[PDB]
Automatic annotation (TrEMBL), chain C:
Statement: the UniProt record of this protein carries the keyword Nucleotidyltransferase: yes
Gene: rpoZ
CC per GO annotation: DNA-directed RNA polymerase complex
Keyword tags: DNA-directed RNA polymerase, Nucleotidyltransferase, Transcription, Transferase
Subunit structure: The RNAP catalytic core consists of 2 alpha, 1 beta, 1 beta' and 1 omega subunit. When a sigma factor is associated with the core the holoenzyme is formed, which can initiate transcription.
Name of the molecule in the record: DNA-directed RNA polymerase subunit omega
TrEMBL record, chain E:
Positions bound to Mg(2+): 96, 98, 100
Molecular function via GO: DNA binding; DNA-directed RNA polymerase activity; magnesium ion binding; zinc ion binding
Record note on quaternary structure: The RNAP catalytic core consists of 2 alpha, 1 beta, 1 beta' and 1 omega subunit. When a sigma factor is associated with the core the holoenzyme is formed, which can initiate transcription.
GO cellular component: cytosol; DNA-directed RNA polymerase complex
Enzyme class: transferase
Keyword tRNA-binding among UniProt keywords: no
Catalysed reaction, written as an equation: RNA(n) + a ribonucleoside 5'-triphosphate = RNA(n+1) + diphosphate
GO biological process: DNA-templated transcription
Annotated organism of origin: Mycobacterium tuberculosis
Role summary: DNA-dependent RNA polymerase catalyzes the transcription of DNA into RNA using the four ribonucleoside triphosphates as substrates.
Keywords recorded for this protein, A-Z: Coiled coil, DNA-directed RNA polymerase, Magnesium, Metal-binding, Nucleotidyltransferase, Transcription, Transferase, Zinc
Protein's recorded name: DNA-directed RNA polymerase subunit beta'
Binding site for Zn(2+) 2: 452, 529, 536, 539
Family: Belongs to the RNA polymerase beta' chain family.
Length: 225, 687, 81, 62, 717, 23, 232
């Protein structure tokens, strides 16, 4: 009953879902490592999201735009589902101009160099003949979830509308372990981690970010006193 | 508060008022349920405060005759045969016959299956009686309950106490930003929402010519057009947001009487008083200890329980003795930074975010020279600021308020607007706040199961299922079998069956449990909507059978067992929980009891002019009342100094309170208490 | 014979009831000594005949009530009933 | 009479108090609560109230 | 500790925060400091933390029934807008978490902060001042979590196995850490019975004697135990040196442990130990599998058979009513008894059918919450429901809430439900009114003297002696004997005295007199205390909250008033009986009494009742006139037979109750004396409070009865 | 189905008793 | 992402082989994420040596009492299970323990072969009666964590050999809790408190360092995938 080094291999289910198998682990160790990777994945993976928006004909959220079926609050809700990635790590402005009739989707947005929209088919608004929609979207990079920054703390003026930022790019993480309880000299656990992301990054890249985070964090115990 | 509250309001039957009775003149006999209230006044929906029994709700099918009595419909039984002839009877008319219960076994022709059936008789007698004696029978099982009471699924499994509380709390639901119809319903939600009047129903059939967020135009068959205007972001009375949204699209054929747009607490025309939440019934580290509630932060991130609230602020410029109050941006001794959000008139601009203390309307009032403090006159002299005979009386944001200014209304006597005599201007500012669910906000279900939010864990801390989906809400198990509200458990089970779907084994015939179920129930797709009518609906046998054939997830795995429990993983440690836990979907409502309104604190502030004691209520920035019983508590502790401090320098000591404030800001010690002014007033009254 | 008292439970209320006859008397002892300490902190820069300063070593930004309670615990004060 | 008039039958007590010309010795919990004095109970009794605390002669160098 | 919102503390400590903002030069002057606090500049949040340091606050929840309705806490700045309350003080505040608010008061003066730190701190008030039993103890989830791991499972994995065959003894661990590792791998269960070598827990006083005895067990000495791992983890919570307890932790067991800890161990130890118990109870309640589901609600197996048998009997009684053989008033009573017996049979069918692993049974049987009557209503049958009249309906609710009530069943249930909610407001009203009357009648009763030196006391029935020779403990020991002080040395058959005069009757000092054969004690009482105005501490006894002798100056009268008025919310006798007693009314019972001791002369008839008494010494015959509607009390005749119905020839004593009911206390006074009428009032009120599950010490009742008899009338000027 | 008269979403009812008179 | 700085590890020594470690402050809520992993890594993934099986002379089928000693078989197994030992050889190694005459047997009375070391020579093992003699063979192996005796059934020869539970892990008892620590204004950051009691084979500092090295390698298996970004 001696140490063999543990190995991690990847199996791809879909373009945004992968299973990772880590074996062999000490008995009882699989659940803890699955939970640590899951907790780091769901909360500390860098991503990009829209910080605030600005519609020309509106001043606040609780109004309507002539010619569109959704009010401003419903448009902001539909924009909360936008998945986007950015290379600049600094605030950058996206633009959206569309005249009715028709439907405005996430593909009608023109992203500046560095940022990219990953679901151009998302419904945003329905415009009739008299409809016109002009919107500016500020995209920043961060991690986790930050509420909409106030206009008193920021330097943004009246026409700017802040939105909640859901930066996390991972969607759903689970795990299962297979334990070998055959009363012999060789007992070991095999961990199977399941990572599903939102097409912003691949599951392996998210797992790699969590791995760097945990390596850096657990290095604190290695240093002596 | 919500459409159901208004409907229920319009259907209230109170005993108080002129010609009725006084509250001090109402014994325990006027308030309790009477056997003649069957099918006329609800025995469940009634307040539990001092107005219990004095205020009821009209039953569903009940009506009023021109005489003033309440009639209820009954099916006329000819000769032991149920007939489709329906007649309305009054109370004494009902007493002159005997009526059979609604859930009586009836032949397809109309004859009763059993000779002896449960029958109600005058003076509230319930007994079996031959089938040749039944004169009438009830129309529907829910004939005796109110509209709000008829909206509680599995009501027959909840005791009358928690049922009363559930019916009363349905009227306290707050309209959320987006609305979800409940998975487990009763069928009453549709008619409640339509008859409430907060939706938009098409008067005449036709096609949709033009649909916008502002209005909907319907092109009729004859050729005429009718346009319905949407009520958008309207302050709905009690501060809630009454917001209507179109449902139909361009060029949709719509029949007469169909919902073309729904408002607050409505989803596709049905009452949506809450959200469907993934619930697990287990204690969790004491954060849900006795009626506290643990929520997933997802409900904050995804605005699941976020609600819009609107407050109205009002101020007027009048004519005073030394001049006239004027609304101006020029306010004495105020920087250009506080006035930066104001327009040239002194009014806050639309779209500006205002915290508490910010200026909404800049109003100055002229104060006489003979009204100046000696220190104030010296301070005016040592700053050289002449011609400042006006003082600041601007409209500021109260403590605890914060939001975006959405509307301004100005009424000027100069501009033909008829104001009360002595008023020159009037301004109303509407402030909208987007309130996310917070720790301490009161949630509740439909079965009288209420509680505040004790903790909002991160999404990873939540006990998650096998496939990684974390639960949304954790309810303590201890507060379930005491209240006798097993409905919430049943609603949970059925709830999960609605979320996943089911498929009954069709081979080798229909199973013995699903023999009574309609053929439309033998198969269900995920996220299906169902109805459990009051005193009818799903039985425990069919529910147990449905739990055994729940549809698997996308991976092909069944997550919950036939018992209704599932295996959960501790999101904090990772070890799976040792035993399976009941997991399902429950309809949770956000009640209008939020900590954003109920929090209050005061160092000093206004004092009542007569008694010189601090004001009362949060709106007046008052303090808490240390009552008589609290004084008894202090005396029982022997805390003499604390009690004397409470009743003197902290309350009505005119000179002691100011010297205490000075001693605090100076770093000195607390001075000796003086004589209360209220005692002086008492002596001057005895004189 | 107990875990370290944390926060407002220090000094332990049991030992403080030994140098005193009752709870109510300990209240007055601590309060009057705290007034003495506060007067020392407010009369340190001006005037003589200032009250006796903190007998024990005071912590940074420690409330005079806590200093008085510790001085009572350390048997550094008297009384007169 | 001050402790009784604040309990029950205010007028019935005040009438007999003015007729008998009763003087109230303000020495009671309710009375001291009303007038703002320390209640003669707990830390308010003269045994614990009037107490002088003095440090033992041992003192630090500075 | 208590958690308060930052925005609340900023406004509460506003002037202090302004002072500190102007000290650390965050603000130029105090005026700009006020403006900073009003604008909530980011500096204040770093300053506020320094301000509230060790500055106690007062939490209050109305209604303030007893003095523990207001308690002092150390404030901790927490985010959010809600007040964070400790789970153990919820019992004192009677505070559930369903939307109720609390008030916060900030003491300013040094005296007020000292009174909060010493007198009103939550950790210094663990015991109930009314009864002396603890309040800050595991109550709901905590008691379930502790009841879980302290359970012995016969078939659990890793259980001890005796040595048989080629394998030795299985399930004997060298260290509790080894047992922890075995449970971690999955071999040992926390509730499995094993043998463990313990080295840091004192063995029970039973086995400690046989192992060591001459010297106490020492931290480091080893000994074997036949417990479970969970029981060892529980025995690690309570302090070092406490005797090991191998019991199953019911709420009663935990309450006994905490009471013993409060009696013997100091205060801070009790506070920290109960904190440990809270944490462990929550941890293991999370993992105890306690869950409610439709599958766990088991229906009685013989439901149909039982209900059909009683439906047969009900139909037979209905047929006996059809022929007119039964009166209409009697048919209802017959059916009532039938269905009461039916509900009892259904409950018995539920008790035996339900396993002990079922969570619904575990919740009730562990003292967590709920009755088995509620479980029977849940799974068996609701039973006889009451109409707004009061009598039970001749037709019961046969269905259970698991099955689903019918329309008419629900309708008839709502009657009783609504009237039960309705009368509660009026009953609370009368309760609070009686409470304030009791407060005003005893507001000025203070402990002003240490010992009034009066050897007067009263005789307390410590125990009764059965005919065989065994001594049965009296039921009134808790409320009348404990926490007392002696006024006469306890003498047994030998010349030695067991407990001296003036010694507080502790828990072992009662067993000392119990094992000595003596069954009556003469104790000092607040009734006999001869003091000018207040009462002396020696007559009063032990302060139930402090656990020691009452301090001089404690307003024991207000404490007594609150102790009586707090449980007055739940009554039926009843609450009007309590008001009849405390207001000295001529009672409804109006039972007669024997004015003179002698021989009974029963001249009973049917038109009326008359009874004379021949005086045992001189005197003349005393004639009474009573209505035949009453019945004579079974008086303990001189024959030593307590069930001797008063017939002519019995030897009754002076002041003996004749017929049943409630004797007029006004007449008891003018017969037996003030002392005896005081005793009568005391235990007559105590009977009403005992018949409801409320334990109030007779001390508090005596405090009021002392004020009832302070005045005398003038016969001759 | 439940309440098939205005054009509402198809909510399926566990109804065993027919509704003779509509609300 | 964004930077998160100043997490520190401080040690408080209770005894020579028991220490409390505080990791503070950690982002909300990383203390819960890493605390269980650190506890399990200490308790399960540190190499150590322990007794696998024993064999007592005179005990063939009774396994009830041993003649000449006051202790029965199970008590001997219990005190021999607590014997602390270290080995440089990975393969199993057989030691012998023989003592005759009345007196007391200690762990120092054992003759250790080259490579192994007994760290508690003063540990009581048995009491030898008048004219008493005790001969016992001890198998010492290397492993990690805790393995029950039943799996050691193969290492005992069919001749009186009895397998014992093997406590390979050098740490004995580890617990942890998370508290709240406010760095600036928010009071959501986590402070982790680990309590580790180990044997005299290694100090708690080295045990924590070994768990840290193993966990760094373990999560480095995931880090070696892409090497992306994350604030420190």
């Amino acid at each position: 009953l001696i140490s063999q080094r543990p190995t991690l291999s990847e199996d791809v289910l879909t373009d945004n879902r992968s299973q990772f198998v880590i074996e062999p682990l000490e008995p009882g160790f699989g659940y803890t490592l699955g939970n640590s990777l899951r907790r780091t994945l769901l909360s500390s993976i860098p991503g990009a999201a829209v910080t605030s928006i600005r519609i020309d004909g509106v001043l606040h959220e609780f109004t309507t735009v002539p010619g569109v079926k959704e009010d401003v609050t419903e448009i902001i809700l539909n924009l909360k589902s936008l998945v986007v990635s950015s290379e600049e790590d600094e605030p950058v402005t996206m633009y959206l101009r569309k005249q009715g009739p028709g439907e405005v989707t996430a593909g009608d947005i023109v992203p500046p160099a560095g940022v990219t929209v990953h679901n151009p088919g998302m419904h945003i608004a329905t415009l009739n003949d008299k409809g016109k929609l002009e919107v500016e979207l500020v995209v920043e990079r961060g991690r986790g979830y930050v509420p909409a920054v106030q206009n008193r703390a920021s330097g943004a003026e009246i026409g700017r509308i802040p939105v909640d930022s859901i930066y996390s790019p991972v969607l759903k993480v689970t795990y299962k372990v297979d334990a070998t309880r055959v009363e012999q000299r060789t007992d070991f656990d095999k961990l199977i981690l399941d990572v599903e992301t939102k097409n912003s990054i691949s599951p392996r890249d998210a797992l790699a970010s969590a791995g760097k985070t945990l390596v850096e964090l657990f290095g604190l115990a290695r240093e002596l006193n | 508060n919500n459409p159901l509250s208004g409907l229920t309001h319009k259907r209230r039957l109170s005993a108080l008022g002129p010609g009725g009775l006084s509250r001090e003149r109402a014994g325990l006999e006027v308030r309790d349920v009477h056997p003649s209230h069957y099918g006329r006044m609800c025995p469940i929906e009634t307040p539990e405060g001092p107005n219990i029994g004095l205020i009821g709700s009209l039953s569903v099918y009940a009506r009023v005759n021109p005489f003033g009595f309440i009639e209820t419909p009954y099916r006329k039984v000819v000769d032991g045969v149920v007939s489709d002839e329906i007649v309305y009877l009054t109370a004494d008319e009902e007493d002159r016959h005997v009526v059979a219960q609604a859930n009586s076994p009836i032949d397809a022709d109309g004859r009763f299956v059993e000779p002896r059936v449960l029958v109600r008789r005058k003076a509230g007698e319930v007994e079996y009686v031959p089938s040749s004696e039944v004169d009438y029978m009830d129309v529907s099982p829910r004939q005796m309950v109110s509209v709000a009471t008829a909206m509680i699924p599995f009501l027959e499994h909840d005791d009358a106490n928690r049922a009363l509380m559930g019916a009363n709390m349905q009227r306290q639901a707050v309209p959320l930003v987006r609305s979800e119809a409940p998975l487990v319903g009763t069928g009453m939600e549709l008619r409640a929402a339509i008859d409430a009047g907060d939706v938009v129903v098409a008067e005449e059939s036709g096609v949709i010519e033009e649909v916008s967020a502002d209005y909907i135009t319907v092109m009729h068959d004859n050729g005429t057009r009718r346009t319905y205007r949407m009520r958008k972001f309207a302050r709905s009375n009690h501060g809630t947001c009454a917001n209507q949204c179109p449902i139909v699209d361009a060029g949709d054929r719509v029949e007469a009487g169909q919902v073309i747009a729904d408002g607050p607490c409505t989803d596709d025309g049905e009452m949506a008083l809450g959200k469907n939440l993934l619930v697990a019934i287990m204690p969790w580290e004491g954060h849900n200890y006795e009626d506290a509630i643990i929520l997933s932060n997802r409900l904050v991130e995804e605005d699941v329980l976020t609600s819009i609230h609107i407050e109205e602020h009002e101020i007027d410029a009048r004519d005073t003795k030394l001049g006239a109050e004027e609304i101006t941006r020029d306010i004495p001794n105020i920087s250009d930074e506080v006035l930066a959000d104001l327009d040239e008139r002194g009014i806050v601009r639309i779209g500006a975010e205002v915290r508490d203390g910010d200026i909404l309307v800049g109003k100055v009032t002229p104060k006489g020279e003979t009204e100046l403090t000696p220190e104030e006159r010296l301070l005016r002299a040592i700053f050289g600021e002449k011609a400042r005979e006006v003082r600041d009386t601007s409209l500021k944001v109260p403590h605890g308020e914060s939001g975006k200014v959405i509307g301004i209304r100005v009424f000027s006597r100069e501009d033909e607007d008829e104001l009360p005599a002595g008023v020159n201007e009037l301004v109303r500012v509407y402030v909208a706040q987007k309130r996310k669910i917070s720790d301490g906000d009161k949630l509740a279900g439909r079965h009288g199961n209420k509680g505040v939010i004790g903790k909002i864990l991160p999404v990873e801390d939540m006990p998650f299922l096998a496939d990684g989906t974390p639960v949304d809400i954790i309810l303590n198990t201890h507060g379930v079998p005491r209240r006798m509200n097993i409905g919430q458990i049943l609603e949970t089970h059925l709830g999960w069956c609605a979320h996943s779907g089911w498929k009954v084994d069709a081979a080798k015939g229909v199973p013995d449990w699903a023999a009574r179920l309609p053929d439309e129930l033998l198969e269900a797709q995920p996220n299906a909507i169902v109805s459990t009518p009051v005193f009818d609906g799903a039985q425990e046998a069919e529910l147990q059978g449905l739990l055994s054939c729940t549809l698997p997830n996308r991976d092909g795995d069944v997550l919950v067992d036939a018992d209704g429990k599932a295996m959960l993983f501790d999101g904090r440690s990772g070890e799976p929980f040792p035993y399976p836990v009941t997991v399902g979907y429950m309809y949770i409502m956000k009640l209008h009891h939020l900590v954003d309104d109920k929090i209050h604190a005061r160092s000093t502030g206004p004092y009542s002019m007569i008694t010189q004691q601090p004001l009362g209520g949060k709106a007046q920035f008052g303090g808490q009342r240390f009552g008589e019983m609290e004084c008894w508590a202090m005396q029982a502790y022997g805390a003499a100094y604390t009690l004397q401090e409470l009743l003197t320098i902290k309350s009505d000591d005119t000179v002691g309170r100011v010297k205490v404030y000075e001693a605090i800001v100076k770093g000195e010690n607390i001075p000796e208490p003086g004589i209360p002014e209220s005692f002086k007033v008492l002596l001057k009254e005895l004189q | 014979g107990y875990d370290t008292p944390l926060g407002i439970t220090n000094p332990p209320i049991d030992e403080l009831l030994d140098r005193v006859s009752s709870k109510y008397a300990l209240v007055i002892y601590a309060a009057k000594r705290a007034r003495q300490i506060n007067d020392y902190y407010n009369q340190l820069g001006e005037g003589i005949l200032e009250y006796v300063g903190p007998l024990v070593e005071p912590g940074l930004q420690e409330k005079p009530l806590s200093i008085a309670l510790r001085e009572i615990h350390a048997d550094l004060l008297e009384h007169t009933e | 009479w001050l402790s009784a008039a604040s309990f029950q039958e205010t007028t019935r007590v005040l009438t007999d108090a003015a007729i008998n010309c009763r003087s109230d010795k303000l020495n009671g919990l309710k009375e001291n609560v009303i007038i703002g004095k320390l209640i003669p109970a707990g830390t308010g009794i003269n045994r614990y109230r009037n107490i002088a605390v003095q440090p033992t002669e041992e003192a630090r160098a500075a | 500790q208590c958690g308060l919102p930052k925005l609340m503390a900023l406004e509460l400590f506003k002037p202090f925060v302004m002072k500190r903002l102007v000290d650390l030069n965050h603000a130029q002057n105090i005026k700009s400091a006020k403006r900073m606090v009003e604008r909530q500049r980011p500096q204040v949040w770093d300053v506020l933390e320094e301000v509230i340091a060790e500055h106690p606050v007062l939490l209050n929840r109305a209604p303030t029934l007893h003095r523990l309705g207001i308690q002092a806490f150390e404030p901790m700045l927490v985010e959010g807008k809600a007040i964070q309350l400790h789970p153990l003080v919820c019992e004192a505040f009677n505070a559930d978490f369903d939307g109720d608010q609390m008030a916060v008061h900030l003491p300013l003066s040094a005296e007020a902060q000292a009174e909060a730190r010493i007198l009103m701190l939550s950790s210094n008030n663990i015991l109930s001042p009314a009864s002396g039993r603890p309040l800050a103890m595991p109550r709901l989830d905590m008691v379930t979590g502790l009841y879980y791991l302290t359970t012995e499972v016969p078939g659990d994995t890793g259980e001890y196995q005796p040595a048989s065959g080629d394998h030795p003894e299985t399930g004997v661990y060298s260290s509790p850490a080894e047992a922890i590792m075995a449970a971690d791998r999955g071999v040992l269960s926390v509730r499995a019975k094993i043998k463990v070598r313990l080295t840091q827990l004192r063995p029970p006083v039973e086995i400690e004697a046989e192992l060591f005895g001459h010297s106490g067990w020492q931290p480091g000495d080893a000994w074997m135990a036949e417990t479970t791992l969970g029981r060892v983890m529980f025995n690690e919570l309570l302090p070092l040196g406490y005797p090991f307890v191998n019991k199953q932790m019911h709420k009663k067991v935990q309450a006994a442990i905490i009471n013993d800890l409060a009696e013997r161990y100091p205060m801070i130890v009790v506070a920290q130990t109960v904190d440990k118990l809270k944490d462990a109870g929550f941890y293991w309640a999370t993992r105890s599998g306690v869950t409610v589901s439709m599958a766990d609600v088991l229906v009685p197996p013989r439901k149909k058979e039982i209900l059909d048998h009683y439906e047969e009997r009900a139909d037979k009684v209905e047929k006996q009513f059809q022929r007119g053989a039964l009166n209409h008033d009697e048919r209802n009573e017959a059916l009532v008894e039938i269905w009461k017996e039916a509900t009892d049979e259904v409950g018995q069918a539920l008790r035996e059918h339900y396993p002990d692993d079922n969570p619904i049974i575990t919740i009730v049987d562990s003292g967590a919450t709920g009755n088995f009557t509620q479980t029977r209503t849940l799974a068996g049958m609701k039973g006889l429901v009451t109409n707004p009249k009061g009598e039970f309906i001749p037709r019961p609710v046969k269905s259970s809430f698991r099955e689903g009530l019918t329309v008419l069943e629900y309708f008839i249930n709502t009657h009783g439900a609504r009237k039960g909610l309705a009368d509660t407001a009026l009953r609370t009203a009368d309760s609070g009114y009686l409470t304030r009357r009791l407060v005003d009648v005893s507001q000025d009763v203070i402990v002003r003297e240490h010992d009034c030196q009066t050897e007067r006391g009263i005789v307390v029935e410590l125990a009764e002696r059965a005919p065989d020779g065994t001594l049965i403990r009296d039921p009134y020991i808790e409320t009348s004997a404990y926490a007392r002080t002696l006024g006469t040395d306890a003498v047994d058959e030998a010349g030695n005295v067991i407990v001296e005069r003036g010694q507080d009757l502790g828990d072992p000092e009662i067993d000392a007199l119990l094992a000595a054969g003596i069954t009556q004690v003469k104790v000092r009482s607040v009734l006999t205390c001869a003091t000018s105005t207040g009462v002396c501490a020696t007559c009063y006894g032990r302060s139930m909250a402090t656990g020691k002798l009452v301090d001089i100056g404690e307003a024991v009268g207000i404490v007594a008033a609150q102790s009586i008025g707090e449980p007055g919310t739940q009554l039926t006798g009843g609450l009007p009986r309590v008001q009849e007693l405390f207001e000295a009314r001529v009672p409804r019972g109006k039972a007669p009494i024997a004015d003179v001791t002698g021989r009974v002369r029963l001249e009973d008839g049917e038109r009326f009742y008359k009874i004379t008494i021949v005086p045992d010494d001189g005197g003349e015959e005393v004639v009474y006139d009573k209505i035949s509607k009453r019945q004579r009390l079974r008086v303990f005749k001189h024959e030593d037979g307590s069930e001797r119905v008063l017939s002519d020839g019995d030897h009754v004593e002076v002041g003996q109750q004749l017929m049943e009911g409630s004797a007029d206390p006004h007449e008891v006074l003018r017969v037996q004396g003030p002392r005896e009428v005081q005793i009568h009032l005391v235990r007559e009120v105590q009977e009403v409070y005992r018949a409801q599950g409320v334990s109030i010490h007779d001390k508090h009742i005596e405090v009021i009865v002392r004020q009832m008899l302070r005045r005398v009338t003038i016969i001759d000027s | 189905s439940n309440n098939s008269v205005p054009g509402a979403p198809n909510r399926v009812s566990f109804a065993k008793l027919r509704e003779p008179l509509e609300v």
